[PDB]
């Protein structure tokens, strides 16, 4: 599924991401834009052999199992394919675990380089939330 911007905002809000660990909703929408372009089916292979999955490009090195990342963990206890569904529940629950780790949203390199410090509220402007 390719979400619309306000569609994704509404879904993230309903699953409790707005203000989660102090990160306003626009931070999460911005992260999703530059991680996946709002595409739940996005996948990208990393240099180390791990793969990033879904709307928030969650990495198999730590968070999900894809059977092809030797030595990795599965801390969200989920197949990585579950992060590609049109229903973002699994991605949101896993994201909550990720952002609760010591580094906050810096875990998402695209958030750090493209969202952090910018006017992230723009990403929810005009949305009926
Ligand atoms: C930059 N890296 C690519 C991020 C990877 C972060 N983790 C690295 C090792 N991590 C341990 C660790 C050691 C020292 C620093 C950090 C950190 O900055 O989080 N984490 C294992 C635990 N896993 C989840 C978890 C669950 C509960 C508590 C904690 C925690 O207290 O850190 N962590 C997170 C993976
Ligand atoms: Cl957009
Ligand atoms: Cl694996
Ligand atoms: Cl594990
Ligand atoms: Cl959904
Ligand atoms: Cl933080
Ligand atoms: Cl915001
Ligand atoms: Na893994
Ligand atoms: Tb950690």
UniProtKB/Swiss-Prot annotation:
Keyword Nucleotide-binding: no
Tissue specificity as recorded in UniProt: In the egg white and polymorphonuclear leukocytes.
Binding site for substrate: 101
Record-annotated active site: 35, 52
Start and end residues of each C-type lysozyme domain: 1-129
Catalytically driven reaction(s): Hydrolysis of (1->4)-beta-linkages between N-acetylmuramic acid and N-acetyl-D-glucosamine residues in a peptidoglycan and between N-acetyl-D-glucosamine residues in chitodextrins
Protein name in UniProt: Lysozyme C
Taxonomic placement: Eukaryota, Metazoa, Chordata, Craniata, Vertebrata
Gene field: LYZ
């Amino acid at each position: 599924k390719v979400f619309g911007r306000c569609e994704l905002a509404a879904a993230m809000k309903r699953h409790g991401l707005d203000n989660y660990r102090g990160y306003s909703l626009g931070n999460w929408v911005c992260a999703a834009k530059f991680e996946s372009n709002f595409n739940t089916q996005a996948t990208n292979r990393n240099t180390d052999g791990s793969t990033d999955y879904g709307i928030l490009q969650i990495n198999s090195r730590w968070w999900c199992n894809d059977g092809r990342t030797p030595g990795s963990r599965n801390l969200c206890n989920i197949p990585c394919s579950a992060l590609l569904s049109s229903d973002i529940t699994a991605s949101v629950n896993c994201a909550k675990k990720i952002v609760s780790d010591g580094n906050g949203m810096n875990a998402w390199v695209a958030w750090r380089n493209r969202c952090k410090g910018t006017d992230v509220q723009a990403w929810i402007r005009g949305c009926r939330l």
